[PDB]
Amino acid sequence: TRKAVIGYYFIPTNQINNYTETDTSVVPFPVSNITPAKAKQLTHINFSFLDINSNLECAWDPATNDAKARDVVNRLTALKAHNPSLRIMFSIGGWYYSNDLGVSHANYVNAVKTPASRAKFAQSCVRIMKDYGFDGVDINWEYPQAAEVDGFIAALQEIRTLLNQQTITDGRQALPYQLTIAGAGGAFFLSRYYSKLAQIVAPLDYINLMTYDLAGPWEKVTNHQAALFGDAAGPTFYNALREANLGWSWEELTRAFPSPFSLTVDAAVQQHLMMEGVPSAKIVMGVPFYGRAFKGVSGGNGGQYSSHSTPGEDPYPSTDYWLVGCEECVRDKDPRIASYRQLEQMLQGNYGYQRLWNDKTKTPYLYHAQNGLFVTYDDAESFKYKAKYIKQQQLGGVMFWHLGQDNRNGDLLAALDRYFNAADYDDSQLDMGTGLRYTGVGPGNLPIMTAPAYVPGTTYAQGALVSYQGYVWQTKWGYITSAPGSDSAWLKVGRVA
Amino acid sequence: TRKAVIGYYFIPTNQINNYTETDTSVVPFPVSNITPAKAKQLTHINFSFLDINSNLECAWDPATNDAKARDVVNRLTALKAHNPSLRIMFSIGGWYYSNDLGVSHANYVNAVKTPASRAKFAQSCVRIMKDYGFDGVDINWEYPQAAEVDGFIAALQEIRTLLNQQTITDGRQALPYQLTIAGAGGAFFLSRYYSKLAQIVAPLDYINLMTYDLAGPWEKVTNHQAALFGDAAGPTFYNALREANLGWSWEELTRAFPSPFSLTVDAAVQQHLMMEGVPSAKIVMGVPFYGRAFKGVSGGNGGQYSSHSTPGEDPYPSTDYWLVGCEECVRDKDPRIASYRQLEQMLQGNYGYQRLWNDKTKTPYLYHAQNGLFVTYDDAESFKYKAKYIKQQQLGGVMFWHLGQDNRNGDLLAALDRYFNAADYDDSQLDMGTGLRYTGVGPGNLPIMTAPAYVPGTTYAQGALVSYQGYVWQTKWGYITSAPGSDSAWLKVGRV
């Protein structure tokens, strides 16, 4: 099966209202940058972002010029003429609109509350999709928590029912309308809805994991924002999944959730695969087309895992633009983030940046010894390891944020398409390295094990292993006269073949 | 409120059938040993043991000569003439009858299975109570498994209903009929029903904790069977409670159940106090009137914490009675147990035993250097700290197993009564020591705290404290944007 290549395409309202394809100071990355050849490299383009309004319906930001909106969307859907497999989805949400303290947060929470609100919201999603010519719906609420998850799931199931009927109604069986969501790529946010992952994923074609932003100025130690595997020398974190309402024992939680652990791409993927009912084919690994920068880093380790003096507030509080060579940063007024396109230019501008590589995390980083800067980002080389990981783990594909941050020639997208589809690219001998792998084992991903059947009336010693009722069990202490599963003395450690 | 002093009184069937108050070799401790002065020192005498028969009703052992039984029981209830607050309860169960592999085990499991079996069993408890003249019911099932707990609870609720009805019917408002159970005094067995403690305790006047047998031949290292507090030099144990079906988070479980931990009396009491709805006034601390003996011990620490060669099998697998001076051990064919009465007699027979004291656990023990023997037991001195502990923790009182093992002078019972009631006994200066205390914190014992009220819309860093819905919470990590109870980043750490 072809690996999905899902590229989000972010275009702010101000840009939609002044859309032009001949002035990069107004629209840095117009749709015209995507040629028929680049259109062929993508399976999905997710237009970002639509929102949920106070009427609790899917809608464009009110400030959007509707005619300019349709026009930008038409330029994207026209790309389908060059790729019969391409879908132009729209994404609802994003950090600014839907974070807990976001401008439209209450609308997300309220829309999923009842059967009536869910039906009215779902219907608006299908109406917007058909009105503008989209091919599916992507939900990017960052993020529903505990009490809101059941509504969220029911909202997804209702959208799924409406889209499936729409597919039949429009005779779109060859290219069915799709539903996806962008999910947390780190344990802290993932802990909010983790216990119900199987239900959340059931109605989706894919869950796009935001496996990046695992590092940033809001953290005290500099680190790679999307390390594939862990580096023992890098910082580790409390595993928040241990606090999810799973109703598992202390032994089960401890075994399933190693802690502290390395916040990596592999960790997020394995955490999703751990849960029974979450198919690998639906998991899509996100990669960033931008980097995050830190200033004030100590030397010696290329700036990795160092204390720093980077403001962590949003918006950027200063007028001081300290990321050398980043003119995009001055225009956008934030020296802490830069598109790959700009970072590649900085590497070309002979500014004193050393492009370094961590062979454990399999990711590049920039170090500016002279000024004490550190930049974590991804490139065509780190993408080789992530693409092989994707094939090896049988994931559904790759997703990236966002199309508009690739360089002018679209090399990052081209690289991804190449790793999955080029006849002349061969990664059979690519060495995945010795970086740290995440190996939590829970009640949902138990290995096959072999042990003598349990014998009623027998007394067992601590550590004894018996098979009973489909599982292999182990005693946590001595003199067990209870049957496996009838009391807290036995730990479920394996499955019977 | 006077502290309860609950003395279990065990009289095996052969002794009832051959009851005599004139022949110590037949009935070592007949009722006549309980003089009026001793009767005034007890609040309850729990006659042991009755059982549950195949008809799934409470009943005396079949081999019991009923007339002799009523005679023994009548002497007990006659004692009430000397103490108007005294209750003569009967206990159903015991290790032999009710343990998982015990002879009547199935009857316990089946009696609590259905509403009909539960009504029939409950009704039989009250009938036996009124028929033989008892003042209450004590259930000592060791122990209901997790799956059998809901039936156990309904059974207790049903007996409670019928006993309160009988109390009104019999005009016993002054001395209401009571219902109690003897509960596990260690985390391994306690973990079977720990999650439903509150429901198990609601229908009871008291839960009598068997906070003893925490050490014995079945363990690889000799240890005190009833240490009040822990000794860092002794063995430690896996805290089975962290595996109970509580539905709590890793943080909550870890803070409530440190592991490994010291298996002590204080640990069992605190473990009970950690659950919401288990009032201290209902918790009764059990103490043993007997010692446990080990052989083949090594020197160095008076026999403590040593490897040993004591058989762990029941019945004792041998006719080798190695407990020097223990004549009673030969009579009962087990040199691994001895009553306080016999231990005392072993001490005055100068057989080479040394009475030592551990000031961490606050308990005595014997050490026989020549034969490499170790004996863990309790006495009037260890009872001073446990009685003070009972007063400090506001527990319901003390319970002991069993009256028939006290000495002829009734020194152990006298000591318990003295510590709670004597006008001339002053323990205000008694030093509880530096032995290890159980540090677990749970729902039932959150410490009083104060903190800024949670503010809707505020982001909190890691470790921030706030008050919300009556409790004080703390964040487990940073950048918290939602409310306590609505975001698992918050840990309920205190209260009002």
Ligand SMILES: CC(=O)N[C@H]1[C@H](O[C@H]2[C@@H](O)[C@@H](NC(C)=O)[C@H](O[C@H]3[C@H](O)[C@H]4N=C(N(C)C)O[C@H]4[C@@H]3CO)O[C@@H]2CO)O[C@H](CO)[C@@H](O)[C@H]1O
């Ligand atoms: C409408 C608006 O808020 N406009 C802002 C704009 O906000 C952006 C940026 O902060 C994006 N950051 C970067 C590094 O591109 C941010 O990207 C988020 C996105 O919200 C999340 N959703 C996904 N998906 C895969 C669905 O990935 C994450 C990414 C990456 O973290 O999105 C917000 C809007 O929600 O920022 C620009 C520049 O600062 C500003 O001028 C203004 O246009």
Ligand SMILES: CC(=O)N[C@H]1[C@H](O[C@H]2[C@@H](O)[C@@H](NC(C)=O)[C@H](O[C@H]3[C@H](O)[C@H]4N=C(N(C)C)O[C@H]4[C@@H]3CO)O[C@@H]2CO)O[C@H](CO)[C@@H](O)[C@H]1O
């Ligand atoms: C019917 C029977 O098995 N009779 C045995 C008798 O068994 C006794 C003894 O083993 C008791 N042990 C000691 C040290 O006294 C044992 O006491 C148990 C009791 O079952 C549990 N219940 C409580 N409560 C407070 C309710 O405490 C524990 C105690 C202490 O572990 O009980 C069994 C019967 O269940 O043993 C004697 C020889 O000692 C033998 O002759 C015979 O009569």
